[PDB]
Subunit: 227 residues, 2 copies
């Protein structure tokens, strides 16, 4: 079926989270890769635990505050000295990230081939908006969407449903792009055409579903559309 | 409020999963602790991804088959030679586990103080039932409950709701016991009195909720009831 719009996940897709791991190392020598791993794990675990526990948003909390919670748990567990300064510093780092250098032109070869572009993110909008301004992609997106509108995190249907609504098109006609295998898979269940930017070369998730195609980077995504 | 029944989580609580990590090492030398960690992570990730994606069971699959999926993904990712024999062997190991030696008497000091006992498990019942027969705890539980009845995994309300239903008592009057911090916390949200068997001495989850009490083992749980 014909793509008529293309929606992106934020972190790891549009925005390289790398710079947080590197700054963790500096505050916590020898413990950066461990913190950053544990922190991402719990950040995601907490969004799922919450949305699963309250399928109508009973336990929702914005992604920012969930990210603080996860960072705090990870430091306590890993026995790291995280008080106000080191916390503020890592969160600042989180607020303002940079793009994968390949992205911004590829977005143009799509904008130019007549394609509306959006972001759909677990990110609360307050953090999603500045995050976008770090990277020079202001203007490229028609819609910048947050699961905060529905108080439910991916893979919840109400989160995926935001993009058909904003674009005025069925899921089947939106190309859904994510770095996270679980999310490409969840989007495929919802009925999008999906592309998985598998940056670390991992296996497909064993979820009995597969995205339409996958590649290694954003420029592989361009390849695929043009075909 | 007065406890009138006590319900247990299965794995890590009643049943020591240890013996699987040890048998992983033997089939996959140098890679047992890595497999076992990645496998537990994805097993749980997959139950949440599924239930979050289909809040009415649209993507349900029994825990057994989810456990095979997770084991398969973990082996592919970790580049381990898992064909039919090594898979069958690890799954066998999974079917039939042993208790924490402290458990079976502690269950008796509770049965004897006039307390009905149950299991509530992500475990499909087919695997939950034999699992119980490995360990000598047949007879101690009035109800052996599986989220398979509702096609939704914890922390889904419909999963927690199984125990009030079976016991004929409100959540507030059941003591809910788990090893998994996320689950003690989810149960507390549902309204149980909860106890967390924190076996590895981890911090509390940063979920803005805490179980009624926590301890290190089952005998700490006994301590707490008797008080
Ligand atoms: Cl992170
Ligand atoms: Cl977790
Ligand atoms: Cl809902
Ligand atoms: Cl395991
Ligand atoms: Cl995951
Ligand atoms: Cl439901
Ligand atoms: K509702
Ligand atoms: K900065
Ligand atoms: K329904
Ligand atoms: K055996
Ligand atoms: Mg995880
Ligand atoms: Mg600590
Ligand atoms: Mg491989
Ligand atoms: Na939709
Ligand atoms: Na209930």
């Amino acid at each position: 079926t014909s793509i008529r719009a293309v929606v992106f996940d934020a972190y790891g897709t549009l925005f390289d989270v790398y710079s947080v791991a590197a700054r963790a190392e500096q505050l916590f020598p020898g413990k950066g890769e461990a913190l950053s791993v544990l922190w991402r794990d719990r950040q995601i675990d907490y969004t799922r635990i919450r949305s699963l526990a309250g399928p109508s948003g009973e336990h929702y909390k914005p992604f920012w505050d969930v990210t603080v919670d996860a960072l705090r748990y990870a430091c306590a567990r890993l026995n790291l000295p995280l008080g106000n300064h080191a916390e503020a510093t890592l969160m600042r780092e989180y607020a303002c990230l940079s793009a994968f250098p390949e992205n911004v032109p590829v977005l143009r070869q799509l904008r130019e081939m007549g394609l509306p572009l959006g972001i759909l993110s677990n990110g609360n909008p307050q953090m999603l908006e500045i995050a976008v301004k770090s990277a020079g992609m202001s203007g490229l997106f028609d819609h910048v969407l947050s699961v905060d509108a529905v108080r439910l995190y991916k893979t919840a249907p109400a989160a995926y449903a935001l993009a058909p609504r904003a674009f005025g098109v069925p899921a089947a006609q939106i190309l859904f792009v994510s770095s996270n295998g679980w999310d490409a898979c969840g989007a495929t269940w919802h009925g999008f055409t999906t592309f998985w930017i598998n940056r670390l070369g991992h296996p497909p998730e064993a979820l009995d579903v597969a995205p339409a195609a996958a590649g290694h980077d954003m420029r592989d995504l361009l390849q695929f559309v043009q075909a």
